[PDB]
Ligand binder design. Structure first.
Ligand SMILES: Nc1ncnc2c1ncn2[C@@H]1O[C@H](COP(=O)(O)OP(=O)(O)O)[C@@H](O)[C@H]1O
Ligand SMILES: [Mg+2]
Length: 755
């Protein structure tokens, strides 16, 4: 009798239907006799009879729908059970605090070799199932960890890596994380430890299924962050870890000071993450005036001083020598000092510029740290070669300085990722388990090239999700004659082609612009609109429903009609953001550095960022399409980074946008485990007496399952394979186990049953 009906902030609320009208149901909220509200018929769902129970697999619910799924994960979350299955897919709700012992070495050991469902839902069980599938099927595997910014993708990715290396090893793969996060993570409004690059981490195994090494692929490091941030955000953690934690000897060698002293840090938040203890370990000369007034930033995970110490320990553990450590820090400090080089107008018509007299020290420190001559650096930032050496305007000098900073830092990040790969190499491997941790679809008031690339990535990955979860799965069910109700989808190749098609795609049109004598963002934007006037996925910014886009000219942006939502991209800076290469004069200044480390970072100048990413993404998709896939859907419970605060409407929105709601019936009515009658019969054959061997493979399988007490609630026979339903992984694993004693025992049971 009680049903779930909409609620503005909780998503759904309990009530009883008291009336029906055209396209409406009248709902009486539970225990509020007399009070009523209207709800659309299609927005009212049946509720589970027992409101207090919780199930480990949502497929176990009598009435699985968006409302009962939300309630089940809510009840579990209230009891610190953050992990729940939907058959073999895992839902992980971010707790925003450390739940005691759930990631301990004892917990890790408890998950080893256990069938899904034998143990409580956990990220370790997804990792173990991928390992078991890898070993049994002799097929590499991918674990895709998805969700909103701050949902827990990076934390769950780290739990998977720790589980696999601790269980199936003979520590560097785990130890590499603090190093990569130092250079590629930063505080954003949505996450204090936001990943500003995407990654695919592979753990490689030998023929005995033991760890031999790893490989990290990195994507789209955010360059804009290097030079300026929003007042509540920070630059990359490394800058603050260095300022908070460096010894006075290092501070002096690098000419470091409190973060408020650097243009590249001082528009963002200049405070450190610290607690009462670590704040006393940070020296007074590292603290900005805002830190001394407002106090430290608080986080349960991050600690700038503590993290610097842990990073140095990680560097030692991985084999990074003390010399390489200082080489990395010198580049980081060189980029900070570069940012302090300021310019002033020069010329009777302000056509040129000069370094401000106050910037003399910054020029000196920067040149010293980057191994450059002060004069060549000053000249390269204030003039342009076209031979002919002409003055730059102040705005152009600021751009040249910032371009050099962004390129040096991005090359340093490429160096760090490569150095980490060199710490766990392998000459050969039989298979791998790869973990994908990349940002999904996102949009803000202002969307630029960074959002354009991430949303393009999302179109391609969404297509992979559709092809694997819906297309391939249902084609198997249909071919096998299973009669599973079909879930349809609309393919997005038209959106992918708009962005990436050769010659006509937006990325190619943008590259065309970078190669022109006088590149222009406006010329690029007009070329897109002119080429794609008939494309239903593209529109001018004036077509938008929002007031913020009313002033955007046709050549100043474009709208992409992604199925996830229409996004208006402002095209200013698309041409500059699309170039990974430095101008020839800055490139030569940096390639000719006195410092070997600097020359080694760099060992018409144009490298397409868009097409570099397209090639990388295609290599990633080649790997995903050729491996088995497991999915973890991370959920962010609130926008306040707080524990025990479940925002039902926000969580419901994520469950809907992720596509999880659209597949609930397909997963519940699906068959995640299967084997052919032939492979089963062939495995048992040698143990069979004649009476069993004489049976056709399908008939032997039927006798085996009946003897073991299995029924239609556990399995269904297809044309060539047996299929096991959700919540039947343990039963399937028993049938599949190839140990001679185990096979002989099951045959003994079948022989006894048959009599
Ligand atoms: N299972 C977890 N246990 C403890 N804290 C967690 C857990 N998952 C996430 N967090 C917290 O949430 C923050 C954001 O998680 P994160 O993995 O960085 O998000 P994402 O990578 O999806 O942007 C973490 O820095 C941490 O404070
Ligand atoms: Mg992350």
């Amino acid at each position: 009798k009680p049903v779930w009906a909409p609620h503005p902030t909780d998503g759904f609320q309990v009530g009883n239907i008291v009336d029906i009208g055209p396209d409406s149901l009248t709902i009486e909220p539970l225990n509020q006799k007399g009070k009523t509200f209207l709800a659309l018929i299609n927005q009212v769902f049946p509720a589970e009879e027992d409101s207090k129970k919780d199930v480990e697999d949502n497929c176990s619910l009598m009435y699985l729908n968006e409302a009962t799924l939300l309630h089940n994960i809510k009840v579990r979350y209230s009891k610190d059970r953050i992990y729940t299955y939907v058959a073999n897919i895992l839902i992980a709700v971010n707790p925003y605090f450390d739940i005691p012992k759930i990631y301990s070495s004892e917990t890790i050991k408890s998950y080893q070799g256990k069938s899904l469902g034998t143990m409580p839902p956990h990220v370790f069980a997804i990792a173990d199932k991928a390992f078991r599938d890898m070993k049994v099927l002799k097929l590499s595997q991918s674990i895709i960890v998805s969700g909103e910014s701050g949902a827990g993708k990076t934390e769950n990715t780290k739990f998977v890596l720790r589980y696999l290396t601790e269980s199936y090893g003979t520590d560097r793969i785990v130890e590499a994380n603090p190093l990569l996060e130092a250079f590629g993570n930063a505080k954003t409004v949505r996450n204090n430890n936001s990943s500003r690059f995407g990654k695919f981490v592979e753990i490689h195994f030998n023929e005995k299924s033991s760890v031999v090494g790893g490989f990290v692929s990195h994507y789209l490091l955010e360059k804009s962050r290097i030079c300026v941030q929003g007042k509540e955000e920070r630059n990359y953690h490394i800058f603050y870890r260095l300022c908070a934690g460096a010894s006075e000897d290092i501070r002096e060698r690098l000419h470091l000071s409190s973060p408020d002293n650097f243009r590249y840090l001082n528009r963002g938040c200049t405070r450190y993450f610290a607690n009462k203890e670590t704040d006393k370990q940070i020296l007074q000369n590292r603290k900005s005036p805002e830190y001394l007034k407002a106090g430290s930033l608080k986080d349960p995970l991050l600690d700038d001083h503590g993290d610097f110490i842990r990073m140095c320990t990680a560097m030692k553990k991985i084999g990074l020598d003390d010399e390489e450590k200082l080489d990395l820090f010198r580049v980081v400090a060189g980029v900070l000092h570069l940012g302090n080089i300021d310019f002033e107008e020069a010329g009777s018509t302000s056509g040129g510029c000069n370094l401000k007299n106050k910037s003399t020290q910054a020029l000196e420190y920067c040149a010293e740290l980057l191994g450059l001559d002060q004069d060549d650096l000053r000249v390269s930032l204030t003039t342009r070669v076209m031979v002919i050496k002409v003055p730059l305007k102040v705005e152009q000098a600021n751009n040249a300085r910032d371009a050099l900073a962004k390129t040096v830092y991005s090359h340093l990040f490429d160096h760090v990722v490569n150095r980490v790969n060199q710490c766990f190499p392998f000459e050969t491997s039989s298979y791998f388990i790869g973990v994908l941790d990349i940002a999904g679809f996102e949009y803000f008031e202002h969307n630029s090239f960074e959002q354009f690339c991430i949303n393009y990535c999302n179109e391609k990955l969404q297509q992979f999700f559709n092809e694997r979860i819906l297309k391939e799965e249902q084609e198997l069910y249909q071919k096998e004659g299973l009669g599973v109700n079909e879930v349809h989808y609309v393919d997005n190749q038209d959106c992918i082609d708009l962005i990436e098609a050769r010659l006509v795609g937006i990325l190619d049109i943008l590259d065309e612009e970078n190669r022109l004598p006088q590149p222009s963002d406006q010329h690029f934007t007009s070329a897109v609109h002119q080429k794609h006037k008939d494309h239903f996925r593209l529109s001018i910014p004036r077509k938008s429903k929002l007031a913020i886009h009313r002033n955007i000219r046709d050549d100043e942006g474009f709208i992409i009609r992604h199925f996830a939502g229409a996004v208006c991209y402002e095209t200013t800076q698309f041409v500059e953001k699309n170039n990974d290469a430095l101008h020839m004069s800055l490139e030569s200044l940096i390639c000719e550095s006195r410092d070997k480390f600097i020359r080694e970072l760099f060992e018409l100048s144009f490298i397409s960022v868009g097409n570099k990413f397209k090639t990388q993404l295609n290599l990633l998709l080649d790997k995903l399409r050729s491996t088995g896939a497991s999915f973890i859907r991370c959920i962010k419970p609130n926008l306040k980074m707080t524990s025990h605060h479940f925002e039902g409407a926000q969580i419901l929105s994520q469950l809907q946008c992720s596509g999880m709601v659209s597949v609930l019936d397909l997963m519940q009515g699906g068959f995640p485990s299967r084997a052919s009658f032939h492979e089963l019969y062939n495995m048992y054959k040698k143990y069979m007496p004649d009476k069993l061997a004489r049976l056709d493979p399908r008939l032997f399988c039927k006798a085996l399952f009946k003897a073991l007490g299995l029924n239609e609630i556990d399995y269904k026979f297809g044309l060539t394979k047996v299929f096991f339903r959700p919540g039947k992984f343990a039963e399937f694993d028993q049938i599949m186990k190839s140990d001679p004693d185990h096979l002989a025992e099951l045959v003994k049971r079948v022989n006894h049953w048959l009599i």
